[PDB]
């Protein structure tokens, strides 16, 4: 905790707070990225941020799309994950590394939010459930 | 499209129990074939402690039998010994000898003409319709007596256990053409026995070689029938797993399509109702 | 995508020569118009897209 | 070309032009039908006419239905295809053969416009892409 910030928007907190907490955390780590230092950020369950934003969108009576998500639920995550960068020498040289977490359902890696964040992030760490239930932990596919 | 997956689920769901039924049918067949193979294994012992085991002979004419299955659900049985009767028929012919190809079973005549068709002469089927007896085995032994080679070759999956099917070769030498010729080791190794038969040694050897080929052919098509039932029991256990895993994929895809169908129809109702209100 | 086409169309029409026009995710043009069109006061089409797709 | 008329409302053309193009071509073919000669009208991609009509009716604030198509999209294709007639001998005896082309998605004929124009027309030449790649071309199921 000497090096960690905790930006907690729990399940009881209102859905604009869970919509906004990745952006608050990414601002707090863009502090370290902008001044030449290095930052790591873990948006734990961006699937739940997209659920919070789907709640905000449908309560705004906005027209939904795939899995009743708004059309800009890709822009929600890409606006956030594009701020994880490696800056140039003219800009300090700092960096910010992001670890978005996405929860699939039955290994369904071709869902809407899962394929949204797959086409934003650089890599992918797919953790299989059947390797996990055979003792092979971390269950790296 | 959504009706294809729900009907395909019922297709794979009945396939996965059809093959499990055939698996338990194969197990119940193996359970009564297991006592017949142990009743009929013992008669190959006195002839092999009497005639030996001479596979790599200088035979000028030879006859090979591949004892395969009739039904086509064996799973790595008829094509394994197809490769064994390929590689073993690579081995005997080393001096430009004649080799006659015989196979027993509907899946053997359809798997041995691919490699040896001009050398194929005889195909036997419908052998395990009711059961196996010494009558039909002796009859196809006579049909190999319609040929007159110097030696005979048998290939069959010997039921060692319910998991191991050792493809055993049995080589049956023609009596006065090759058997006493292969026994002349500092005299003759057969002359220690005293012939009690009505005629000379050549004729009791002829009757003996006919009876030996008949009893090893009976043992071959009983060993292979029991290993056929065992291999169908094993291959319809691996197949039930495959039709259970495909059903596990198809139920998940059906539930994804079900949820997407309800969300799509709901979104259409909401857009149509909000166009008015 | 229209800016990329205009820079290419000056080469095709005025300069009069072969050009190569690579576009990375022309889907994002359609998706961006779907995000815009949700707020322009329109009835949404099939699976959630704009009517003028 | 000396026997063919080519009516082309293309993709850059406005949605009312792609809506009214098959009626234009059918009215041009009705000249040869009504004068005792024979015609052959081919409405290529009647599904794209239905898409243009869907856009044109959704922007007119008419309430959408199944696949956001309007109510009268059966009437749209039926009142067009019923103009292909073999006239009686007292009207010249001319004819008009119509060939509407419908594109389906992964062989799904349970779609909306596909069921409409299947029920409207007389026959169907149902082509498959799994027989098209088996060498059987024309890929007639």
* Whether residue B111 is found in the same domain as residue B220: yes
Instruction: Tell me: do B44 and B67 sit in the same domain.
Output: yes
Is the CB of B275 less than 8 angstroms away from the CB of D67? Answer: no
Residue of C38, C50, C53 best to disrupt the A interface, most CBs of A under 10 A:
C38
Cβ <8 Å between C35 and A72: yes
Sign of CA dihedral B70, B76, B81, B86: positive
CA distance C32 to A71: 8
What's the number of domains chain B is made of? 2
Q: Specify whether B228 is located in the same domain as B269.
A: no
| Cβ of residue A75 closer than 8 Å to a chain C Cβ | yes
If you ran DSSP here, which 8-state letter would residue C12 be given?
Answer: I
Contacts of A43 (CB under 8 A, 6+ apart): A22, A25, A26, A49, A80, A98, A99, A100, A101
Beta carbons of B117 and B101 less than 8 angstroms apart: no
Same domain for B111 and B20 = no
| Interface residue ranges in chain C relative to chain B, Cβ cutoff 8 Å | 43-44, 47-48
Q: CA B210, B214, B215, B221: dihedral to nearest 10 degrees? A: 160
Q: Which of B163, B229, B248 is nearest to B22 (CA)?
A: B229
Chain B residues whose beta carbon lies within 8 Å of the beta carbon of residue D65: 268, 272
H-helix segments, chain A: 15-34, 46-59, 73-81, 112-118, 129-132
Nearest by CB: C52 against D55, D63, D67: D55
Q: How far apart are CA D76 and CA D20, in angstroms?
A: 10
**How far off is chain B from A69, nearest CA to CA, in Å?**
10
A130 touches chain B (CB under 8 A): no
Measured distance CA(C2)–CA(C24) in Å, rounded: 13
- The CATH number for B252's domain is 1.10.287.80
Count how many residues are written for chain A.
141
Q: Distance between CA atoms of D23 and D16, rounded to whole angstroms?
A: 11
**From CA A127, how far away is CA B3, in angstroms rounded?**
33
Q: Which helix (H) or strand (E) holds D97?
A: strand D95-98
Question: Tokens representing A8?
Answer: 């907690």
Regarding whether B171 and B39 lie in a shared domain, the answer is: yes
Q: Count of CB contacts below 8 A, C vs D?
A: 25
Whether residues B260 and A67 touch (CB distance < 8 A) is answered with yes
In 3-state terms, what secondary structure has residue D35?
A: coil
Shared domain check, B131 and B172: yes
Q: Which residues is B11 bridged to in the sheet? A: none
Cis, bond preceding A23 (omega within 30 deg of 0) = no
The resolution, in angstroms to one decimal, equals 3.2
- Judge if B216 and B161 occupy the same domain: yes
User: In 10 A of CB A72, how many CB atoms?
Assistant: 21
Query: Are residues B20 and B144 part of one domain?
Result: no
Cα atoms in the 13 Å half-sphere on the side-chain side of A38: 2
Question: At which residue do the structure tokens 């939010």 appear?
Answer: A113
Q: Retrieve residue A114's tokens.
A: 């899962």
Q: What is each CA distance from B239 to A125, B7, B68, in whole angstroms?
A: 32, 20, 21
* B132, B195: one domain: yes
Binding residue per annotation — D44? yes
Strands B165-173 and B151-159, sheet pairing:
antiparallel
Domain that holds residue B149: 25-235
CB-CB neighbors (< 8 A) of B275 in chain C = 43
d(CA D55, CA B93): 79
Q: Is B121 exposed, middle or buried (0-12, 13-18, 19+ CB in 10 A)?
A: middle
User: Are residues D106 and B271, on separate chains, in Cβ contact within 8 Å?
Assistant: no
Helix, strand or coil for residue A100?
A: coil
Q: Scanning the structure block, which residue is given the tokens 């789907």?
A: A54
Q: Would you state the structure tokens that stand for residue C36, as one six-digit string?
A: 């815009």
* Statement to judge: residues B182 and B270 lie in one domain: no
How many Å lie between the alpha carbon of C42 and the closest alpha carbon of chain D? 7
Whether B268 has its CB under 8 Å from any CB of chain D: the answer is yes
Is D53 in a helix, a strand, or coil? helix
Q: Is the dihedral of CA A129, A134, A137, A141 positive or negative?
A: negative
Q: Where are the beta strands (DSSP E) in chain B?
A: 61-67, 98-104, 120-124, 151-159, 165-173
What's the CA gap between B60 and B45, in Å, rounded?
Answer: 27
Query: Do the Cβ atoms of B214 and B143 come closer than 8 Å?
Result: no
Q: How far is CA B44 from CA B32, B213, D118, in A?
A: 21, 10, 72
**B275/C43 touch (CB, cutoff 8 Å), yes or no:** yes
Same domain, B72 and B190: yes
Joined together, the tokens standing for residue B153 give: 């070759």
B62 plus B149 within the same structural domain: yes
């Amino acid at each position: 905790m000497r090096y960690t910030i905790m930006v907690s928007a729990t399940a009881s907190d209102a859905a604009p707070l869970q919509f906004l907490a990745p952006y608050s955390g990414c601002a707090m780590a863009e502090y370290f990225r902008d001044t030449g230092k290095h930052g790591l950020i873990i948006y734990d369950d961006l699937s739940k941020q997209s659920v919070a934003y789907r709640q905000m969108s449908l309560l705004l009576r906005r027209p939904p799309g795939r899995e009743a998500f708004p059309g800009d639920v890709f822009y929600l995550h890409s606006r956030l994950l594009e701020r994880a960068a490696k800056l140039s020498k003219e800009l300090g040289g700092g960096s910010l590394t992001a670890f978005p977490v996405i929860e699939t359902q039955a290994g369904d890696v071709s869902a809407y939010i899962a394929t949204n964040v797959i086409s934003i992030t650089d890599g992918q760490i797919f953790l299989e459930t059947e390797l996990f239930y055979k003792g092979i932990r971390p269950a790296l596919n | 499209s959504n009706q294809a997956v729900k009907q395909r689920i019922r297709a794979i769901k009945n396939i996965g129990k059809i093959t499990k039924a055939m698996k338990m049918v194969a197990a119940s067949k193996m359970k009564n074939a297991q006592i017949a193979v142990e009743q009929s294994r013992g008669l190959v012992d006195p002839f092999v402690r009497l005639f030996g085991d001479f596979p790599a002979v200088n035979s000028n004419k030879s006859v090979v039998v591949a004892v395969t299955s009739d039904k086509g659900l064996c799973g790595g049985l008829n094509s394994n010994i197809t490769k064994y009767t390929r590689a073993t028929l690579a081995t005997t012919e080393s001096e430009g000898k004649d080799v006659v190809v015989v196979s027993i079973g509907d899946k053997g005549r359809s798997q041995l003409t691919r490699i040896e068709s001009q050398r194929y002469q005889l195909a036997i089927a419908d052998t395990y319709k009711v059961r196996v007896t010494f009558g039909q085995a002796s009859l196809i032994v006579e049909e190999l007596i319609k040929h007159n080679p110097q030696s005979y070759q048998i290939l069959f999956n010997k039921f060692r256990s319910a998991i191991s099917f050792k493809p055993t070769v049995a080589t049956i030498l023609s009596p006065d053409l090759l058997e006493k010729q292969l026994e002349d080791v500092t005299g003759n190794s057969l002359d220690a026995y005293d012939i009690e038969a009505s005629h000379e040694r050549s004729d009791v050897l002829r009757d003996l070689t006919e009876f030996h080929l008949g009893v090893t052919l009976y043992n071959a098509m009983l060993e292979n029938n029991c290993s056929e039932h065992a291999s169908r029991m094993s291959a319809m256990e691996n197949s039930t797993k495959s039709a259970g895993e495909m059903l596990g994929k198809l139920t998940l895809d059906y539930n994804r399509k079900r949820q997407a169908t309800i969300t799509t129809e709901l979104i259409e109702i909401i857009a149509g109702a909000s166009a008015l209100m | 995508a229209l800016t990329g086409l205009t820079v290419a169309e000056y080469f095709r029409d005025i300069e009069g020569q072969d050009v190569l026009l690579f576009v990375d995710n022309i889907f994002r043009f359609t998706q961006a118009n779907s995000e815009v069109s949700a707020l322009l006061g329109r009835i949404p089409s099939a699976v959630g897209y704009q009517p003028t797709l």
